[PDB]
Amino acid sequence: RDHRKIGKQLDLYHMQEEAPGMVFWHNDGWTIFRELEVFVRSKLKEYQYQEVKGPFMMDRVLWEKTGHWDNYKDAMFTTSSENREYCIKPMNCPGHVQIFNQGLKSYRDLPLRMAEFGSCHRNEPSGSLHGLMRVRGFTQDDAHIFCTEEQIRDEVNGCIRLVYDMYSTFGFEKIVVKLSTRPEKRIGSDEMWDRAEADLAVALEENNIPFEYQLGEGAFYGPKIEFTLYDCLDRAWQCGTVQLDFSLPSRLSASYVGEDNERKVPVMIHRAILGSMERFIGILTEEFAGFFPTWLAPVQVVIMNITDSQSEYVNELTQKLSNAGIRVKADLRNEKIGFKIREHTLRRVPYMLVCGDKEVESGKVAVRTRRGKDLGSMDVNEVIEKLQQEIRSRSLKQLEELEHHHHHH
Amino acid sequence: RDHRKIGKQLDLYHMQEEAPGMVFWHNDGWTIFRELEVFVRSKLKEYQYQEVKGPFMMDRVLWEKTGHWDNYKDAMFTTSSENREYCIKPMNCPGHVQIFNQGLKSYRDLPLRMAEFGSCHRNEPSGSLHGLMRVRGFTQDDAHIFCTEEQIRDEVNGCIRLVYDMYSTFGFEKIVVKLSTRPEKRIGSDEMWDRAEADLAVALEENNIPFEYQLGEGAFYGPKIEFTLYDCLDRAWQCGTVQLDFSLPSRLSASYVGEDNERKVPVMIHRAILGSMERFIGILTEEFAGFFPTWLAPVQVVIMNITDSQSEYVNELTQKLSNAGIRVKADLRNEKIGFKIREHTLRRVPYMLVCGDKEVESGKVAVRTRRGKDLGSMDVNEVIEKLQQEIRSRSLKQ
Numbered sequence: 186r187d188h189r190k191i192g193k194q195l196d197l198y199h200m201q202e203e204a205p206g207m208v209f210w211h212n213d214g215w216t217i218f219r220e221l222e223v224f225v226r227s228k229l230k231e232y233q234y235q236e237v238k239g240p241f242m243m244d245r246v247l248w249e250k251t252g253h254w255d256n257y258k259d260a261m262f263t264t265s266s267e268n269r270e271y272c273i274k275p276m277n278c279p280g281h282v283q284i285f286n287q288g289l290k291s292y293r294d295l296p297l298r299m300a301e302f303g304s305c306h307r308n309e310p311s312g313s314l315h316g317l318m319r320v321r322g323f324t325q326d327d328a329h330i331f332c333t334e335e336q337i338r339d340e341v342n343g344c345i346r347l348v349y350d351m352y353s354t355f356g357f358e359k360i361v362v363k364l365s366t367r368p369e370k371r372i373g374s375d376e377m378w379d380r381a382e383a384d385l386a387v388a389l390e391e392n393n394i395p396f397e398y399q400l401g402e403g404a405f406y407g408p409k410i411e412f413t414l415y416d417c418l419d420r421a422w423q424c425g426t427v428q429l430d431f432s433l434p435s436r437l438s439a440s441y442v443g444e445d446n447e448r449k450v451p452v453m454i455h456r457a458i459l460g461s462m463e464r465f466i467g468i469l470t471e472e473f474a475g476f477f478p479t480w481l482a483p484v485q486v487v488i489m490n491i492t493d494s495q496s497e498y499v500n501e502l503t504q505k506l507s508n509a510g511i512r513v514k515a516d517l518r519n520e521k522i523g524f525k526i527r528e529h530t531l532r533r534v535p536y537m538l539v540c541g542d543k544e545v546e547s548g549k550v551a552v553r554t555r556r557g558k559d560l561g562s563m564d565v566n567e568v569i570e571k572l573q574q575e576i577r578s579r580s581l582k583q584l585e586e587l588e589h590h591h592h593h594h
Numbered sequence: 595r596d597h598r599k600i601g602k603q604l605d606l607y608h609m610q611e612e613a614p615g616m617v618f619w620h621n622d623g624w625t626i627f628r629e630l631e632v633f634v635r636s637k638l639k640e641y642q643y644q645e646v647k648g649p650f651m652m653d654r655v656l657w658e659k660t661g662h663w664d665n666y667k668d669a670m671f672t673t674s675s676e677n678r679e680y681c682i683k684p685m686n687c688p689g690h691v692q693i694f695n696q697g698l699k700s701y702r703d704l705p706l707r708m709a710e711f712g713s714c715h716r717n718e719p720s721g722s723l724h725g726l727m728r729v730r731g732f733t734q735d736d737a738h739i740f741c742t743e744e745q746i747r748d749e750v751n752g753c754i755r756l757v758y759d760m761y762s763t764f765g766f767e768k769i770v771v772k773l774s775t776r777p778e779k780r781i782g783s784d785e786m787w788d789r790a791e792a793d794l795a796v797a798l799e800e801n802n803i804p805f806e807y808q809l810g811e812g813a814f815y816g817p818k819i820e821f822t823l824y825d826c827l828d829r830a831w832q833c834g835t836v837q838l839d840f841s842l843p844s845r846l847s848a849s850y851v852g853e854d855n856e857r858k859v860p861v862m863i864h865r866a867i868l869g870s871m872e873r874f875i876g877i878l879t880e881e882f883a884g885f886f887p888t889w890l891a892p893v894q895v896v897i898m899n900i901t902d903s904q905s906e907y908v909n910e911l912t913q914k915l916s917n918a919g920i921r922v923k924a925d926l927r928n929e930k931i932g933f934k935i936r937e938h939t940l941r942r943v944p945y946m947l948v949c950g951d952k953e954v955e956s957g958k959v960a961v962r963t964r965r966g967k968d969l970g971s972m973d974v975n976e977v978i979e980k981l982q983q984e985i986r987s988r989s990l991k992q
């Protein structure tokens with residue numbers, strides 16, 4: 186089932202014609218986006234990345250210098266102020282290079298790993314738009330690594346390791362990998378492309394990763410390893426990408442002082458792990474058919490009463506779970522228990538805590554899941570500890586559950 | 595002390611002529627921005643706000659409907675795709691109404707408090723640009739509260755209480771309040787403006803806030819309370835603002851079913867507490883002269899060895915502090931300890947931990963501060979607990 190239908194069902198986002206391919210993230214979809222940012226940040230910390238933010242627009246002159254204007258013109262939105270023309274950024278790399286270019290850099294500063302949740306706009310043909318998977322405004326979990334020639338192997342290897350490490354959290358382990366080689370419109374010499382292409386192929390080989398070439402699909406500035414994930418119709422979507430660039434730094438006058446006090450141009454590795462937040466959310470939505478892992482679930486727990494008699498109890502518990510950091514909602518409606526459960530199941534809420542008279546008495550809760558399972562009564566404190574552990578460990582599967590819902594086995 | 599020189603010295607941000615008023619946040623400046631986002635979110639959690647994200651641009655037609663095109667044209671950047679013109683948003687409000695308009699609403703949903711860290715672009719004349727205080731691309735800690743007429747007083751009071759609550763964290767001694775009334779170009783009837791201006795004046799007086807009128811300086815859609823803060827040269831900068839709007843929702847066909855079954859247009863309150871992150875960071879930078887309180891400091895601790903004898907111990911402590919949630923770096927360079935200390939001192943790192951042989955043997959650390967205070971030898975868990983406490987409490991000094 187399509188992520189667009191599931192997105193409406195869970196009130197995650199919408200789009201209008203007033204803004205084709207521009208996403209409106211509602212509260213619950215934004216919750217997912219934000220949790221993914223937190224997850225990526227935990228990895229940026231561990232793998233020692235800076236995190237920056239570059240501006241939305243820069244002078245067209247800068248975009249001409251990179252080769253974007255010649256090779257990327259059709260896709261760029263432009264605007265102007267006071268007789269000067271600006272491009273809304275389609276990529277974050279040039280901004281990163283401008284940051285690099287502030288202050289003298291030395292070999293001591295390398296590898297310099299510079300991440301950004303970088304908002305890009307690309308004027309994708311309106312015929313090619315597709316839900317969250319192909320929009321016009323999207324946010325990459327981007328980074329550029331500025332390094333020496335001698336550091337390419339280790340740094341490309343690090344990016345590859347990070348892809349599998351992050352994808353394993355979602356249960357994606359058998360990943361389809363491509364090496365996209367020099368496109369017809371490109372900058373840089375043949376010799377530079379032969380080297381960059383060999384370097385990426387050797388890294389994949391060294392990591393024992395099977396891949397195929399994809400002829401002519403590289404970026405204008407360098408070849409790309411692509412990590413493909415599949416949607417519900419098995420369409421291939423580029424998500425992770427690791428790219429090797431011997432051209433942009435030089436075009437933008439990037440340099441550092443080497444060990445012999447000579448001026449050197451840094452190599453730049455580009456990579457995104459999730460790809461874009463929008464595309465990755467669309468993929469997860471379809472793969473899990475909206476059964477997001479508890480850490481990602483917009484609403485983690487719903488606590489419900491049978492009658493008005495338990496309203497006070499449900500309210501205390503909701504407050505208690507909320508202070509414990511759990512995303513929790515009360516459902517106090519005069520509706521049958523089965524009716525409530527069906528609704529919150531369609532809403533894909535991991536856990537539903539049913540409070541009848543006996544629950545109020547014993548200070549317990551009757552626990553149901555969105556997979557139709559009855560986990561009996563549990564102590565409130567026990568439920569809290571078990572949920573907190575499920576959240577903190579970013580567990581793919583629920584209490585007492587063998588297999589989470591996922592389309593591709 | 596000017597935030598622009600401090601921002602250069604502490605490697606917080608830069609700007610270039612290839613992008614006038616367009617900020618490049620470097621790692622250390624972005625850390626401050628991110629910490630302010632965490633703080634705002636924690637406050638909006640208690641005050642029960644949703645948090646959304648609206649599109650960066652929308653059809654010019656939408657901005658024509660709201661009155662932005664006729665009353666706000668010169669400030670807006672525009673762009674095109676496939677023969678249709680788009681405005682890059684200068685405000686988040688119309689996007690928020692669009693989200694409100696998805697799904698039937700009733701009185702049960704109100705007050706609906708909808709927050710966004712909303713990136714706006716405004717084509718400010720280049721002669722008016724000034725460091726971080728007045729840029730062309732900035733992010734508001736914005737929100738719109740959709741409510742009934744009967745809820746206006748409580749909701750305006752709630753915004754005012756939020757401003758003072760959040761501002762107390764930063765210790766601002768001079769908060770000057772203005773009430774900005776109907777401008778020359780506006781939407782809404784004179785009667786609507788009478789009511790809106792009175793509601794804000796009454797809210798200020800009930801909250802015991804002295805204020806001055808700023809005649810004709812209100813927004814095109816409503817009057818504004820402004821919470822003014824002052825930079826090093828005592829120049830006035832609008833930061834917090836609370837505005838009362840009886841017009842935009844109607845122009846955008848917003849409605850809900852009331853408790854009495856009558857379908858009405860919601861009132862909308864616009865507010866920002868910090869103002870923009872950029873402007874507020876410029877203010878903080880001058881307010882503290884770059885000596886950010888620990889919770890905001892880009893790097894909270896640097897740990898140094900005297901010689902490589904203590905390298906291993908320094909790495910161990912660095913990992914230990916980092917796991918404790920502290921922003922900590924190891925400085926293992928082959929430089930004299932007095933050279934390393936001076937560098938981190940000038941960088942305004944709150945705490946410096948020095949490890950020589952005596953510290954390794956004892957499992958302690960020698961602690962000094964960026965103000966030159968020497969706290970002597972401290973046990974490691976005690977420094978961790980103290981730091982965590984001062985971070986969690988967002989303490990103004992220590």
Ligand SMILES: C[C@@H](O)[C@H](N)C(=O)NS(=O)(=O)c1cccc(-c2ccc3c(N)ncnc3c2)c1
Binds near residue numbers: 327457461
């Ligand atoms: C990895 C970066 O440093 C590199 N500069 C780059 O942009 N590479 S990319 O063009 O291959 C790339 C990387 C990640 C995401 C996308 C992408 C492109 C278009 C999208 C779209 N139109 N809608 C949704 N997601 C999208 C993601 C592209």
Ligand SMILES: C[C@@H](O)[C@H](N)C(=O)NS(=O)(=O)c1cccc(-c2ccc3c(N)ncnc3c2)c1
Binds near residue numbers: 716728732835
């Ligand atoms: C509170 C909002 O819902 C309201 N729609 C609004 O934008 N009001 S505002 O125009 O008074 C306002 C509010 C908050 C920040 C700014 C502002 C404007 C320009 C800036 C600039 N040019 N540079 C830096 N910060 C800035 C902040 C303006």
Ligand SMILES: [Zn+2]
Binds near residue numbers: 276277278456
């Ligand atoms: Zn790039």
Ligand SMILES: [Zn+2]
Binds near residue numbers: 686
């Ligand atoms: Zn507004």
